[PDB]
């Protein structure tokens, strides 16, 4: 019964938030540090942050659209009918996942967006000196990265949520407390920060390439974290699409 376009019609299209997130990933990946490319010191790329904003509001909108549909389904479906209780519990579980995921993706997208910001701001603190050396104001950048660390966003799971389950679900890139407060590991940010040098430093093509490779590696590690999160997020959207399809079949079967 419940078909794909049936969900789309109800205003539920996972592809929207999924594409927007992949667009924010493509943007981030497109950012780089200045470097010598084909006999020319080419400055890095400046990020379009609005892309990340688009992804957050789209994730929020999908979440709202999902609960709406879930609520209509639950209300239409309602000693003793074991099927009724079962589905009712499933719905409760679905509702919590919807929120839990929207919150997490939202927070990581803000953190992701904040990194894109420093990846573009630091372009003004790194230039070329001669032709085989670069100048880098490490201090200025360092402070740029610390600002992100200092203002990392904090996320709260839905009341009565299996913390143990989310710890293993979310992975190492994040951290959860017994209160359900999830925080973002600053591991990559710290490494990237402690790689910089004193303001006014000047390294040769080899010294700069060495660091920029190290640095770039940490940034790519940040993008894998979000890619893994996004992939898990999508699997959630599938599960939702599924629960909703079986809920509809149940209503049909049960009516009458």
UniProtKB/Swiss-Prot annotation:
Keywords associated with the record: Coiled coil, Secreted, Virulence
Transcription regulation listed as a keyword: no
GO CC field: extracellular region
Keyword Secreted: yes
Coiled-coil blocks: 81-125, 204-253
Subcellular location: Secreted
Domain of life from the UniProt record: Bacteria
Primary localisation category: secreted
Function as written in the Swiss-Prot or TrEMBL entry: Required for invasion of epithelial cells, as well as for survival within host cells, escape from endocytic vesicles and subsequent actin-tail formation. Probably regulates the secretion of effectors BipB and BipC and their final integration into the target cell membrane.
NCBIfam families to which the protein is assigned, alphabetical: SipD_IpaD_SspD (TIGR02553)
Additional facts recorded: Human meliodoisis patients have detectable antibody response to BipD. However, BipD does not act as a protective antigen.
Domain commentary: The N-terminal domain is an intra-molecular chaperone that prevents premature oligomerization of the residues on the coiled-coil region that are involved in interactions with the needle and/or itself. The residues in the C-terminal domain probably form oligomeric structures at the tip of the needle that are responsible for the regulation of secretion of other effectors.
Family listed: Belongs to the invasin protein D family.
Listed name of the protein: Translocator protein BipD
Source organism phylogeny: Bacteria, Pseudomonadati, Pseudomonadota, Betaproteobacteria, Burkholderiales
Gene: bipD
């Amino acid at each position: 019964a419940m078909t794909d376009d049936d969900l789309r019609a109800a205003g539920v299209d996972r592809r929207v938030p999924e594409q927007k997130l992949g667009a924010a990933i493509d943007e981030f990946a497109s950012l780089r540090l200045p470097d010598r490319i084909d006999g020319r010191f080419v400055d890095g790329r400046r990020a379009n942050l609005t892309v990340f904003d688009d992804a957050r509001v789209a994730v929020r909108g999908h979440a709202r659209a999902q609960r709406n549909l879930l609520e209509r389904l639950e209300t239409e479906l309602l000693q003793p009918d074991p099927i009724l209780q079962g589905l009712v519990d499933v719905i409760g579980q679905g509702k919590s996942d919807i929120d839990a995921y929207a919150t997490i993706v939202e927070g990581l997208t803000k953190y992701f967006q904040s990194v894109a910001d420093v990846m573009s701001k630091l372009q003004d603190y790194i230039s070329a000196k001669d032709d085989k050396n670069m100048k880098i104001d490490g201090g200025k950048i360092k402070a740029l990265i610390q600002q992100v660390i200092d203002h990392l966003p904090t996320m709260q799971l839905p009341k009565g949520a299996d913390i143990a389950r989310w710890r293993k679900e979310l992975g190492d890139a994040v951290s959860i407390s017994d209160s359900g407060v999830v925080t973002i590991n600053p591991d990559k940010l710290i490494k990237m920060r402690d790689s910089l040098p004193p303001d006014g430093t000047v390294w040769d093509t080899a010294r700069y390439q060495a660091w920029n490779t190290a640095f770039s590696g940490q940034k790519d590690n940040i993008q894998n974290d979000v890619q893994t999160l996004v992939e898990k997020y999508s699997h959630q959207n599938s599960n939702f699409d599924n629960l909703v399809k079986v809920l509809s079949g149940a209503i049909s079967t049960l009516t009458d």
